[PDB]
Amino acid sequence: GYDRALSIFSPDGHIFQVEYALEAVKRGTCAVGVKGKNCVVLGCERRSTLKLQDTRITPSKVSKIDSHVVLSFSGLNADSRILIEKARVEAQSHRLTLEDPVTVEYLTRYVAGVQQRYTQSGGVR
Amino acid sequence: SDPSSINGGIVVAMTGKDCVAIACDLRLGSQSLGVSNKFEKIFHYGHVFLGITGLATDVTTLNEMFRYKTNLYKLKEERAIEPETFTQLVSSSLYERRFGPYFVGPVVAGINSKSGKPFIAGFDLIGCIDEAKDFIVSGTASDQLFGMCESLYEPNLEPEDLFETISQALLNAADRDALSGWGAVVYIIKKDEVVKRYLKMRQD
Amino acid sequence: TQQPIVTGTSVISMKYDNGVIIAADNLGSYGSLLRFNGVERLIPVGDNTVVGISGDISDMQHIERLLKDLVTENAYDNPLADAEEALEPSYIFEYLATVMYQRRSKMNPLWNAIIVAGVQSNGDQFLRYVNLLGVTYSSPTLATGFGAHMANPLLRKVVDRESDIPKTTVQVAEEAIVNAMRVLYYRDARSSRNFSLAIIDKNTGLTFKKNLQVENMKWDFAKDIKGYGTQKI
Amino acid sequence: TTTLAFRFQGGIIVAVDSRATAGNWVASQTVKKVIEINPFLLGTMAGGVADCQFWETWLGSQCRLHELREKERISVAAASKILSNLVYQYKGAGLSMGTMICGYTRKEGPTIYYVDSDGTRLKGDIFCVGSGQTFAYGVLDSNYKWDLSVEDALYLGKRSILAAAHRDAYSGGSVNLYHVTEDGWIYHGNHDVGELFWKVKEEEGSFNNVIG
Amino acid sequence: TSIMAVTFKDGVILGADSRTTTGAYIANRVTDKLTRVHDKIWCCRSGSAADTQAIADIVQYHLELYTSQYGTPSTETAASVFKELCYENKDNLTAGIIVAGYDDKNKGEVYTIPLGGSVHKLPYAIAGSGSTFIYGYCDKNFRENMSKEETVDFIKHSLSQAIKWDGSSGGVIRMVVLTAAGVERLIFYPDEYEQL
Amino acid sequence: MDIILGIRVQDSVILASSKAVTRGISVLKDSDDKTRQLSPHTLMSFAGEAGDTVQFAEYIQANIQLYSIREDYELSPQAVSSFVRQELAKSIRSRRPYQVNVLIGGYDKKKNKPELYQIDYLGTKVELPYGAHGYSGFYTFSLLDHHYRPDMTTEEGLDLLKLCVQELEKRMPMDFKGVIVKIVDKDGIRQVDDF
Amino acid sequence: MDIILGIRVQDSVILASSKAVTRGISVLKDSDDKTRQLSPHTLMSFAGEAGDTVQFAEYIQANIQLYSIREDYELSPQAVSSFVRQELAKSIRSRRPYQVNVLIGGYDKKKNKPELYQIDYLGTKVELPYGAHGYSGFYTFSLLDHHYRPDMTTEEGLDLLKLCVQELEKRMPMDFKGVIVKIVDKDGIRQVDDF
Amino acid sequence: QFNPYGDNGGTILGIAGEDFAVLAGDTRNITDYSINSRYEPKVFDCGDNIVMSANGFAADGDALVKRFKNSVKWYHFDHNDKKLSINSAARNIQHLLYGKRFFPYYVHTIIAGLDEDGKGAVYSFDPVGSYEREQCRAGGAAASLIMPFLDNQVNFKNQYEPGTNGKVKKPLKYLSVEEVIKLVRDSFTSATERHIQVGDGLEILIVTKDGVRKEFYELKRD
Amino acid sequence: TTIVGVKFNNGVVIAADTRSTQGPIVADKNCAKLHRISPKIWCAGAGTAADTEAVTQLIGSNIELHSLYTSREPRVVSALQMLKQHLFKYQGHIGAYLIVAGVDPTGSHLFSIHAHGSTDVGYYLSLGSGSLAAMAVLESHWKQDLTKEEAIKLASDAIQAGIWNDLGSGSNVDVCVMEIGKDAEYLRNYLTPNVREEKQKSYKFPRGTTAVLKESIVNICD
Numbered sequence A: 001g002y003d004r005a006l007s008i009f010s011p012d013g014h015i016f017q018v019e020y021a022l023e024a025v026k027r028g029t030c031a032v033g034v035k036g037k038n039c040v041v042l043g044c045e046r047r048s049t050l051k052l053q054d055t056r057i058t059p060s061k062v063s064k065i066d067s068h069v070v071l072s073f074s075g076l077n078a079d080s081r082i083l084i085e086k087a088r089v090e091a092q093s094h095r096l097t098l099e100d101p102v103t104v105e106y107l108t109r110y111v112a113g114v115q116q117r118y119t120q121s122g123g124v125r
Numbered sequence B: 001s002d003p004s005s006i007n008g009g010i011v012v013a014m015t016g017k018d019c020v021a022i023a024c025d026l027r028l029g030s031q032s033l034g035v036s037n038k039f040e041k042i043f044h045y046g047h048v049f050l051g052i053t054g055l056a057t058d059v060t061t062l063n064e065m066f067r068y069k070t071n072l073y074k075l076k077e078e079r080a081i082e083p084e085t086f087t088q089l090v091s092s093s094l095y096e097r098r099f100g101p102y103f104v105g106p107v108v109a110g111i112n113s114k115s116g117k118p119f120i121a122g123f124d125l126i127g128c129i130d131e132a133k134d135f136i137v138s139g140t141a142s143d144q145l146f147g148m149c150e151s152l153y154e155p156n157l158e159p160e161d162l163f164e165t166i167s168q169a170l171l172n173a174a175d176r177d178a179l180s181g182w183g184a185v186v187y188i189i190k191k192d193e194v195v196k197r198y199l200k201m202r203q204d
Numbered sequence C: 001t002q003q004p005i006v007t008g009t010s011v012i013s014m015k016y017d018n019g020v021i022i023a024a025d026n027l028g029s030y031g032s033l034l035r036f037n038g039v040e041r042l043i044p045v046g047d048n049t050v051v052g053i054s055g056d057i058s059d060m061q062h063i064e065r066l067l068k069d070l071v072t073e074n075a076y077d078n079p080l081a082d083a084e085e086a087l088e089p090s091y092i093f094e095y096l097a098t099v100m101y102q103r104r105s106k107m108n109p110l111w112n113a114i115i116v117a118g119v120q121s122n123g124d125q126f127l128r129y130v131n132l133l134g135v136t137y138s139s140p141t142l143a144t145g146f147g148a149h150m151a152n153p154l155l156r157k158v159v160d161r162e163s164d165i166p167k168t169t170v171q172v173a174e175e176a177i178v179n180a181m182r183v184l185y186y187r188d189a190r191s192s193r194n195f196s197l198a199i200i201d202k203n204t205g206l207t208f209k210k211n212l213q214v215e216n217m218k219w220d221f222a223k224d225i226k227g228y229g230t231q232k233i
Numbered sequence D: 001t002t003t004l005a006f007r008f009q010g011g012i013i014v015a016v017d018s019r020a021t022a023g024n025w026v027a028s029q030t031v032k033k034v035i036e037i038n039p040f041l042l043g044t045m046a047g048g049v050a051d052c053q054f055w056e057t058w059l060g061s062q063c064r065l066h067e068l069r070e071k072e073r074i075s076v077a078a079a080s081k082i083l084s085n086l087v088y089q090y091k092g093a094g095l096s097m098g099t100m101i102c103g104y105t106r107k108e109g110p111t112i113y114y115v116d117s118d119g120t121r122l123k124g125d126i127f128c129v130g131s132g133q134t135f136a137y138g139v140l141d142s143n144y145k146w147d148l149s150v151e152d153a154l155y156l157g158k159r160s161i162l163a164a165a166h167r168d169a170y171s172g173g174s175v176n177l178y179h180v181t182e183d184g185w186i187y188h189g190n191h192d193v194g195e196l197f198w199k200v201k202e203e204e205g206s207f208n209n210v211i212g
Numbered sequence E: 001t002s003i004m005a006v007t008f009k010d011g012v013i014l015g016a017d018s019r020t021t022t023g024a025y026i027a028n029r030v031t032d033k034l035t036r037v038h039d040k041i042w043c044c045r046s047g048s049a050a051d052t053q054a055i056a057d058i059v060q061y062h063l064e065l066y067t068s069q070y071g072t073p074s075t076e077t078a079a080s081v082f083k084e085l086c087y088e089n090k091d092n093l094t095a096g097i098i099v100a101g102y103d104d105k106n107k108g109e110v111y112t113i114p115l116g117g118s119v120h121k122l123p124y125a126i127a128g129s130g131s132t133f134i135y136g137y138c139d140k141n142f143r144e145n146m147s148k149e150e151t152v153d154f155i156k157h158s159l160s161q162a163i164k165w166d167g168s169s170g171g172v173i174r175m176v177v178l179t180a181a182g183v184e185r186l187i188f189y190p191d192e193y194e195q196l
Numbered sequence F, G: 001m002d003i004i005l006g007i008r009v010q011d012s013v014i015l016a017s018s019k020a021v022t023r024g025i026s027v028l029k030d031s032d033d034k035t036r037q038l039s040p041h042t043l044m045s046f047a048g049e050a051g052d053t054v055q056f057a058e059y060i061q062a063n064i065q066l067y068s069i070r071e072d073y074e075l076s077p078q079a080v081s082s083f084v085r086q087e088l089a090k091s092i093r094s095r096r097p098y099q100v101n102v103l104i105g106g107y108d109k110k111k112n113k114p115e116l117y118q119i120d121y122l123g124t125k126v127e128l129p130y131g132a133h134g135y136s137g138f139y140t141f142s143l144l145d146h147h148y149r150p151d152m153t154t155e156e157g158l159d160l161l162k163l164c165v166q167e168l169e170k171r172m173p174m175d176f177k178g179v180i181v182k183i184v185d186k187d188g189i190r191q192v193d194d195f
Numbered sequence H: 001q002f003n004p005y006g007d008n009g010g011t012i013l014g015i016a017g018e019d020f021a022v023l024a025g026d027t028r029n030i031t032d033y034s035i036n037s038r039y040e041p042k043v044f045d046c047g048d049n050i051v052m053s054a055n056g057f058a059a060d061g062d063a064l065v066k067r068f069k070n071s072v073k074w075y076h077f078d079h080n081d082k083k084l085s086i087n088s089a090a091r092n093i094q095h096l097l098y099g100k101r102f103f104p105y106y107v108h109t110i111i112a113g114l115d116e117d118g119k120g121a122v123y124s125f126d127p128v129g130s131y132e133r134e135q136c137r138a139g140g141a142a143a144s145l146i147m148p149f150l151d152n153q154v155n156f157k158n159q160y161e162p163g164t165n166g167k168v169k170k171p172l173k174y175l176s177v178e179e180v181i182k183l184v185r186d187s188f189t190s191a192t193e194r195h196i197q198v199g200d201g202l203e204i205l206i207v208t209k210d211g212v213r214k215e216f217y218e219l220k221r222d
Numbered sequence I: 001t002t003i004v005g006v007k008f009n010n011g012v013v014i015a016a017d018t019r020s021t022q023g024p025i026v027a028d029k030n031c032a033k034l035h036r037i038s039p040k041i042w043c044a045g046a047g048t049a050a051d052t053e054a055v056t057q058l059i060g061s062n063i064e065l066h067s068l069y070t071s072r073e074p075r076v077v078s079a080l081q082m083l084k085q086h087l088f089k090y091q092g093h094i095g096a097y098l099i100v101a102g103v104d105p106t107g108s109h110l111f112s113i114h115a116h117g118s119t120d121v122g123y124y125l126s127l128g129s130g131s132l133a134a135m136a137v138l139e140s141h142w143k144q145d146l147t148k149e150e151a152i153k154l155a156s157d158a159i160q161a162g163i164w165n166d167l168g169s170g171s172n173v174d175v176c177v178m179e180i181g182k183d184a185e186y187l188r189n190y191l192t193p194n195v196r197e198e199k200q201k202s203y204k205f206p207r208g209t210t211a212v213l214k215e216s217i218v219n220i221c222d
């Protein structure tokens, strides 16, 4: 198996691969979240250099993780699908064992834990 | 389906100074289910006492059989049967069913009216006589009774003291056995008086 | 899960004032067939330990190879291999006891009963038993198979407890062993006349006696025995 | 064993005996068959002692890890399901367990779950578990009402174990009582059947089958 | 057991070891397996000790009652009575018996009766668990019309080997000579026969 | 066959017996009377192996009726119970034993007392204030230990019996289709039609 | 576990499932719901080995719910039934197979038709107008062969179902403590509270 | 077919006092009807004032003691030479036993020592790891003989105050070390009389705050 | 059980231990295993206890009737023949293992009988679970031309070997000497090397310790 440590420290105490991953987020389309007194709203930008698009079938920017939680993102589109899939599976697993849907904090903690694991595992970016 | 441990129960006997004692519990059950708490296991034919443990139907049958036989004995002999002689009769009757036996553990106790000597005996299911100076045990808690008797017993105990020893032997043995208990009876037997006492014990 | 094929019968042993004695016959039985007659079942380890083995012979030969290899491995990087860091009887036993219990726990035992006899570096007598189940015990006298039933009673008349060990000489001890072997020839149907004996003394060391025979036997009274009950001829 | 627990107006009553057996040998009369998982959760034990004792104490460790991770006490449902999912993994291997997980939480209220070694998990108001469960049911069912007082409910639980202790050969020793409220579980003492039987017989006038 | 019977010029000789076992324990090391059913008609017993003894006792009773009415019975007649008991009770018996006897008309004769209860007249016969190891030896060394000394040596050497290889055989070698002269008992001890 | 119960009160003996007869996965009948009158003041209920039960009950009935005619006299409940026990005690060591368990309820006219006897297929006899055969006892005995008193009336005994049937209908796995109830007292034997 | 029934009528599918849970000689519960909603218009009832039943039902439930979230779309009853069959077909050659029999009732919104599937623990699937698992079928199939028509209403289907339960309560040996009834149609899944 | 279990006989006994605790056991070792050794100890000092005995199949017994002794050694290495309390030892032993739940150690285990308040403590285990603290326990071949005697003499079971109409029980009290040793000796002589696998010798280990003392007594050798 | 028989100059001697077992439990500590068939013919019995007593009493009864019928003292071979044919008929189901010995007009005799009905002759014999321990002693110390006192010593020594080494055997040694021309002497408890030591404590209870519910006088008279 491919083992190489890709995410490592530099002399100044930075992990460049993690910081360069932030640059990919900066390149991505804008996404905003605002919460009111009795609601939350998620807004997302879509770039207009792409005409002749089919909006029926094109992957939407906001994804349902469960019937009560949603997830939007900024950055590499392909990478986001992997996180969304893992989150959706964990959501159903939680309902199965705890007999209660996930809290938003719990779901976030899981997704964040996956992202962290990919910063100190060999052979992955 | 082990005939000797379906119903449960115990019997113990002891000797003292010019006296004998025989005791038993009152339980009759069907495996885990307790059914009756009035099922006495000690019987007597004249001055000779017989205790029987094991399969309850055979306990009843053998009592009825030995009443039958001792009644005829007395009519022909014109005297009461003695413990030594009755012991031989029990042995003969059990061995007669060698290859289809009564599933029982009998115990004889009494005082010979001629000599005055205290006498006890035990048997296995096919009739082997087990004579003893000190004590005889029988039933589903025989291991427990053997341990209690071997430590508590001393020779030449007075009737009042002997009562305490045999009662404590039975009670503490019964409480370590699931199929024994639910009450107890003790018989103190002197040359020409016999006292019967019911013991207070835990009812579980 | 095994069944034993070629088998060896009793191994007997005891302690005396200055050391230990051990013996076993030279037979390799194939069921009722007395197949092999030149089989040595006492195996020395150094000049201070003898291991006597009964049961399956193929498993015995495997244990021989393990002991042989243990000597080799102990000599590696060990300047004191023939002195302070030599193999003790207690080391050899504990190794075998470990193996026997591990094999039974894997449901694939070495089908044997083993007695390790020897003298320690401080002069103390060593005698301990181990079998296919991994069961271990020690006693002034030890025996396997039929020996346990017939030899032990005879050997316990000489040494009945610990305090009888200083009062027992090597002459008296050997006499009792040799007698016990004769009794086994009379009464064990898988024994032979030929046997080996080994003495380990704290002063005179290891003495290994081969090709011994059972002698001074009583058979003459057989001529007087006729029939099985009422026959007079 | 005989164990029970029932739900009522004033919370949950839990009652157990204290006998342990190996065949007909009475091995102990003083065994603890209730396990205190936390101030709001209880577990009852029937079947194999080692199995029950080992895995229910394991269950407590898993419940403690939940509240450390989630900053909140575990639900009775989630606690019972950890145990039922564990024993399901071992299904066929020969584990022997009849357990009841009892407790109170805000979202659930007073709750009882039956969990056993062949994987059965059931929510319910009344359960009796063990070799003497039928004897306990007989008394409990015939005297149960939802509107029982705390005092009367405690007694009925005690009296039901006593009934089983008397008739079942593999039940006895003493009765251990527990009451579970919105504030947590409360212990209501150890009661020896040696003294309790006669006390109940005299005061109540019951047990006329026995020689007084 | 190892047992055999051999005919020769002057009559017939029976031979046997003296070992009785329970598993691997020797219950008797000086057993007599050669047993009299009539003056000059004997038998070698193998198999179950209880069965063979009970059979031999019944035969001896039959031949004693035969003699009282019809005089001395033939060796064939004796074998027939053994057969009748062994065959009709084959389901309940474990007995391998050799029958041997001396007539003046018929001289020496040997009948063997295996487990099934069949009868076989032979010049010589071997049986028992130890016999398996000496089929080769006995076939190569047996001659007809041997002398007394030659026949004693043949049986001694044969049983020696049977004993050497069979764990269920051992002890002393008992023999019984049957001739016109009478009945002679011989015994041979381990120190002699082992080093042959 | 399955459920048979018995309760002895002050002045009477009450027997309750299930009405169902089931073979395989089919309830063949729901009105079966599992009892026989042995004499005017003695009643026997029964349960066990198919065929054996009725064959045994009627055999006992015939023998007791024969005795009554011969002596012009009614045997006591104690005497009848002893006869039945001995017949079962003989049976257990036969080539093919009777697999039948019975309850005998009777009123002794000489003693003016009700009597209830429980006898199993081995010939194990006991006199009891209340009794049951089979799995029924695992519920009813503990219940009766609590609610039973020795000085109860017949009406009180019927209410006590309703409490047993209700519990069995709640906790028993099989549908036994209710019970037929009969009372034995000084005036003989009668059936309760509405239960 | 024991009794599960299913009937497909003109515009709906009706599932009836027994409420009893019995272990040994004790009915531990009389209000057990032997079903799980897999999706808004699909319902699965189940019966079989203790533990296996609920474990299997919830495992299927989780997988179908996962699919719904991923695709934002409801799988057809036919598609769900095929997924369930394959899982049971895998199971039967495992080290320890799931011993669970199921009925799947659903309303296909694209076809505007009700559908009922019967699947056993081996993975044997069939689409049927009416179905049953276990010993229930030995009574209900012949009954439905007589009284069932394809154009019946939901109310007619409920009366037809009452006729089945009545027969089972008359002839079945065990007390199954009644049934919970649920209807699946164009408007989803609902429970009948008074049956 | 190979049978991995055997029975080595013998019996063991543990009693606890106010400031002490004893663990006794006979020295006889047997297989079937033969004696293997008249003196083969099976009660061991395991360190930290904890004594232990695992009676039944000797090979499993030795293995368990060996593993617990080693568990004490590593407890010191990993937790700065901290003393392993009797309650902690008991829990650790449950895990040792239950680890082989599906191929069990065939033994009855008893440990003895002082608790953290200095008071006497006795714990007892079944073959698969259940445990319970008690004042009193007998284990092994003669357990059924000795245990009921202990209920009567240590815990005063079935004994009432004379003249009180069986209403007042005999009050519980701690026994002196002298009185306890008397009960142990009598228990084993009685067991020797009526059980064939018990005899030869008796070895008692006493545990106080001062340490672990030994006493030996002869038993009948038949 | 351990039982033996030894021949000497002018007769024969037999011996036996006195332990009776019930599994691993000692039922009787001093039971008699030496049986009288006739005055000068005696029997040592091992195996099933009820069978050995019943078979010895039946043959003993028939031997007495035979003796009276023939006006002759009974012979050992007659007892032997009657025992073997009875045991054979029952195909081993009557579990009696006997050593038969005695003196009669023909001389002194020593035989053994097994349960299936086979018999053996010998100068020295041993039966029972401790027969191997006893036979080891007999094979070691037996010689031709033993005196009376030498034979008693050898026989009791062989029984002792069984007592100490066999778990099936124990307690005391019983002996019976049968010499030609003299009465047979039955030496009950010839050796008693297993006396129970003094107990450490008296377990005499204070009067009133046991709780009582009812008292009543029992009528034994007519």
Ligand SMILES: *[C@@](C)(CO)[C@](*)(O)[C@H](CC(C)C)NC(=O)[C@H](Cc1ccccc1)NC(=O)[C@H](CC(C)C)NC(=O)[C@H](CCc1ccccc1)NC(=O)CN1CCOCC1
Pocket (backbone or CB within 6 Å): D001, D002, D019, D020, D021, D022, D023, D025, D027, D031, D033, D045, D046, D047, D048, D049, D050, D052, D096, D130, D131, D170, D171, H101, H104, H125, H126, H127, H128, H130
């Ligand atoms: C009521 C009292 C009856 O079931 C309860 O159900 C209690 C449950 C409470 C205490 C948690 N159950 C028992 O007491 C339980 C019944 C039982 C027995 C065996 C298997 C399953 C259930 N008893 C036990 O678990 C006893 C506990 C005491 C201390 C002896 N343990 C044993 O019987 C052990 C271990 C059993 C075992 C399980 C799995 C694999 C192997 C073994 N067995 C022994 O100690 C062996 N035996 C004791 C008798 O002496 C010879 C050796």
Ligand SMILES: *[C@@](C)(CO)[C@](*)(O)[C@H](CC(C)C)NC(=O)[C@H](Cc1ccccc1)NC(=O)[C@H](CC(C)C)NC(=O)[C@H](CCc1ccccc1)NC(=O)CN1CCOCC1
Pocket (backbone or CB within 6 Å): E001, E002, E019, E020, E021, E022, E023, E027, E031, E033, E045, E046, E047, E048, E049, E050, E051, E052, E094, E128, E129, E130, E168, E169, I114, I116, I118
């Ligand atoms: C050689 C040994 C083999 O051919 C000879 O044939 C001799 C014949 C001589 C003695 C006439 N055979 C034996 O010694 C014979 C071997 C034998 C064993 C079992 C069945 C058939 C043959 N041994 C015996 O007959 C002994 C004699 C006793 C010890 C004095 N008897 C037993 O071993 C009995 C036999 C019971 C029996 C079984 C089947 C058919 C008939 C009888 N068996 C036991 O006592 C069982 N024993 C219990 C303890 O465990 C070991 C076995």
Ligand SMILES: *[C@@](C)(CO)[C@](*)(O)[C@H](CC(C)C)NC(=O)[C@H](Cc1ccccc1)NC(=O)[C@H](CC(C)C)NC(=O)[C@H](CCc1ccccc1)NC(=O)CN1CCOCC1
Pocket (backbone or CB within 6 Å): B004, B103, B104, B105, B123, B124, B125, B126, B128, B129, B130, I001, I002, I019, I020, I021, I022, I023, I027, I028, I031, I033, I045, I046, I047, I048, I049, I050, I052, I095, I128, I129, I130, I168, I169
């Ligand atoms: C030594 C001890 C063993 O080599 C001796 O051989 C002695 C012989 C003397 C006493 C004559 N043998 C015994 O002590 C003998 C051992 C034994 C056990 C079982 C079968 C054969 C031999 N003990 C007995 O025979 C006892 C005698 C009692 C203690 C007075 N009897 C039992 O143990 C009976 C055996 C009954 C039996 C029936 C059918 C076939 C064979 C044997 N068993 C019981 O009593 C056990 N159980 C008690 C509960 O009720 C049911 C029976």
Ligand SMILES: [Cl-]
Pocket (backbone or CB within 6 Å): C228, E020, E031, E032, E049, E053, I118, I119
């Ligand atoms: Cl023979």
Ligand SMILES: [Mg+2]
Pocket (backbone or CB within 6 Å): B203, B204, D164, D165, D166, D167, D168, D169, D170, D171, D172
């Ligand atoms: Mg109870």
Ligand SMILES: [Mg+2]
Pocket (backbone or CB within 6 Å): H221, H222, I162, I163, I164, I165, I166, I167, I168, I169, I170
């Ligand atoms: Mg002994």
